Amino acid sequence: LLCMLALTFMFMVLEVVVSRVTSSLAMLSDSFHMLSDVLALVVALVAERFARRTHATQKNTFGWIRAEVMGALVNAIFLTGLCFAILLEAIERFIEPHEMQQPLVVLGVGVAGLLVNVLGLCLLNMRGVFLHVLGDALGSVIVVVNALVFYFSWKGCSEGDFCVNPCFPDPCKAFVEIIASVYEAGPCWVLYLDPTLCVVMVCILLYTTYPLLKESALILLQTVPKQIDIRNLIKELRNVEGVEEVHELHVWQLAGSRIIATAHIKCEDPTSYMEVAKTIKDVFHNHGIHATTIQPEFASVVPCELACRTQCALKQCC
Amino acid sequence: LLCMLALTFMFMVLEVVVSRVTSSLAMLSDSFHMLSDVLALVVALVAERFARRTHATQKNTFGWIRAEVMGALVNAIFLTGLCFAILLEAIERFIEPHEMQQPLVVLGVGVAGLLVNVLGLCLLNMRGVFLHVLGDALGSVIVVVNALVFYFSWKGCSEGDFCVNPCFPDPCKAFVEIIASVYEAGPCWVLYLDPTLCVVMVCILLYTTYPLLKESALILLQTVPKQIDIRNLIKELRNVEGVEEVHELHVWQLAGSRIIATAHIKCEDPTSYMEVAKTIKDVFHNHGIHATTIQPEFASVVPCELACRTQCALKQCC
Ligand SMILES: CC(C)CCC[C@@H](C)[C@H]1CC[C@H]2[C@@H]3CC=C4C[C@@H](OC(=O)CCC(=O)O)CC[C@]4(C)[C@H]3CC[C@]12C
Ligand SMILES: CC(C)CCC[C@@H](C)[C@H]1CC[C@H]2[C@@H]3CC=C4C[C@@H](OC(=O)CCC(=O)O)CC[C@]4(C)[C@H]3CC[C@]12C
Ligand SMILES: CC(C)CCC[C@@H](C)[C@H]1CC[C@H]2[C@@H]3CC=C4C[C@@H](OC(=O)CCC(=O)O)CC[C@]4(C)[C@H]3CC[C@]12C
Ligand SMILES: [Zn+2]
Ligand SMILES: [Zn+2]
Ligand SMILES: [Zn+2]
Ligand SMILES: [Zn+2]
Ligand SMILES: [Zn+2]
Ligand SMILES: [Zn+2]
Ligand SMILES: [Zn+2]
Ligand SMILES: [Zn+2]
């Protein structure tokens, strides 16, 4: 983990610095994606370290096990925020285009990123990581092809001869239009490739990270998992022996694949309660739910036999 | 709520657009703060709309009560991401200083924001809103004083007269040293003022948003609330004549003041369980807990009388 984490972090630092100095948007977006990747590795390591020894902690009774889910959510939404900022910068660049400072350094960092992804390729359990590395390499080669197209087409100028087309506003009024030799700059295919390509990059990043963010948000919010069917479960619970009807059923996913159930039941006879709670355990275990807790209300218009009279209707769940 | 929402959103759009036009970072940070405020209002409205008709939906058995807290976390982390982008821009501006484009429009939008905050004042439950609007007004004061100081002190050349600037690199090297020696006034107190005020603004935003993010994170992660002491509660539960030992006790907060408790008690005398259950209800209602699902495991090699046959990968918590 750390063996690639350190390399990715150091490359991220240099990449961010040189990109924002050179002020090229697609490069900045690719560096932000590498930033999201390295923070994903960081949160994965933190979650593994915390989950290695989870117990009945004084502060957290359940344990810091939702750490991986919350880290995924934080990374996804942090990337979304940075991507929104980058899109705002791209719109600003549409407002007033700027040329690339130096294609040579951009090509160098692009091939460096390509080599970084190639090295990471060597290091679906591993196929998912390989696909993520391939997507990062795709972003890197998009940066590289941007650099190539800019270098091959943008003839530009480096002398005092009239070179800048009216599309690009002249710097410092071009010395009041020199108060020289006639020259025409590059065609209308550059000075716009960088932002019109960074928008594609940011759109693809948003499309890739939306399902992960949605899944993490649904996990963090108390939502029944798609695997468990609430209607089938409630109907099958009603169709048991010794139980009249069930209420206050709460089912939610904690993290990964450990589901917690909660319900209240009523039994006709207090005697011989066992072999009935065993039936409830078996029927819950039949579905994906494994950790349960069933409170019996022993045997009428009142919904639940156990309710504090002086209770904030709200405070009491549902 | 929407009456101020529409005005705030329209002003946010205008200020963001004009700030990106003029490239002023302090105004950009203030606009980001306004964006955070309007998004907070939006999430509050949607949370109230969802909470007005909270029901045991098939997808969400608990209900979308946690929507407000999730929106608060989303806003806090989005603001943090935008603030990180702002720090990147500020470090860039330290690397290469750029002067403000048009002080007049910046002063106009600053006084417009001040008037917006004044109208907000015109329109703890309300003391918190007063504190927030006073903070936003303070940010507007920062941006307007930045504009005022830049306008009065800066004396950059506008015409073709000589202006030797060592502070900022001249565009096109001033026609390559031109291939009325007017000197600028106080470059130190002018060029660097905007990025440093932006850094101060973003630092104060981080300081004022960190506690909210921490509380929201502790709410989403299943953490015992600071109001309830878990050790005292378990000691009182153990100090009950009916129950022998209490195991698998989980306490967590849903949203606001809604605490749900879970326990696996073991007791004898099946015909008198309800006598114990009333005592458990009373002792839980003594603390902040108001919703419990105490499951009696009726009668020490095995800790819990009910358990999965395989308990694969100990999905069941603890
Ligand atoms: C790319 C940008 C967003 C910077 C990311 C930096 C991370 C490496 C930082 C940000 C938040 C940090 C965490 C914030 C809080 C804590 C709790 C801390 O536990 C304590 O000792 C708590 C002490 C207390 O507050 O009482 C251990 C480090 C940790 C996990 C930090 C680990 C390092 C983190 C993830
Ligand atoms: C071009 C500029 C102005 C940026 C535009 C941003 C949004 C208009 C885009 C970015 C990502 C898009 C989302 C990417 C993915 C999806 C999932 C897609 O299908 C699903 O909901 C689930 C698909 C699946 O998982 O198979 C519906 C459209 C949606 C929400 C897209 C809606 C439009 C979004 C938010
Ligand atoms: C501007 C850039 C370059 C640096 C930004 C640094 C911030 C992320 C740091 C600087 C000072 C820090 C604060 C210094 C002191 C505290 C008090 C302390 O918070 C509490 O009060 C929690 C404990 C309590 O319950 O009293 C720890 C977090 C906090 C807000 C820190 C949060 C992180 C801050 C804002
Ligand atoms: Zn990646
Ligand atoms: Zn099971
Ligand atoms: Zn009940
Ligand atoms: Zn109560
Ligand atoms: Zn309930
Ligand atoms: Zn505000
Ligand atoms: Zn038990
Ligand atoms: Zn447990």
From Swiss-Prot, chains A, B:
Protein name: Proton-coupled zinc antiporter SLC30A1
Ranges per topology, Extracellular: 22-25, 90-103, 151-185
Sections of the chain in a coiled coil: none
Keywords noted in UniProt: Antiport, Cell membrane, Cytoplasm, Cytoplasmic vesicle, Endoplasmic reticulum, Glycoprotein, Golgi apparatus, Ion transport, Membrane, Metal-binding, Nucleus, Phosphoprotein, Repeat, Transmembrane, Transmembrane helix, Transport, Zinc, Zinc transport
Pfam families documented for this protein: Cation_efflux
Induction annotation: Up-regulated by zinc (at protein level). Up-regulated in macrophages by LPS (at protein level).
Membrane-topology annotation of the record: Multi-pass membrane protein
Domain of life, source organism: Eukaryota
Biological process terms in GO annotation: cadmium ion transmembrane transport; calcium ion import; defense response to bacterium; detoxification of cadmium ion; detoxification of zinc ion; in utero embryonic development; intracellular calcium ion homeostasis; intracellular zinc ion homeostasis
Subunit structure, as described in the record: Homodimer. Interacts with TMEM163. Interacts and forms a complex with TMC6 and TMC8; the interaction regulates zinc transport into the ER.
Transmembrane regions: 1-21, 26-46, 69-89, 104-123, 130-150, 186-206
Entry keyword annotation includes Zinc: yes
Known role: Zinc ion:proton antiporter that could function at the plasma membrane mediating zinc efflux from cells against its electrochemical gradient protecting them from intracellular zinc accumulation and toxicity. Alternatively, could prevent the transport to the plasma membrane of CACNB2, the L-type calcium channels regulatory subunit, through a yet to be defined mechanism. By modulating the expression of these channels at the plasma membrane, could prevent calcium and zinc influx into cells. By the same mechanism, could also prevent L-type calcium channels-mediated heavy metal influx into cells.
Parts of the chain on the Cytoplasmic side: 47-68, 207-318
Alphabetized GO MF terms: calcium channel inhibitor activity; metal ion binding; zinc ion transmembrane transporter activity; zinc:proton antiporter activity
Binding residues for Zn(2+): H33, D37, H132, D136
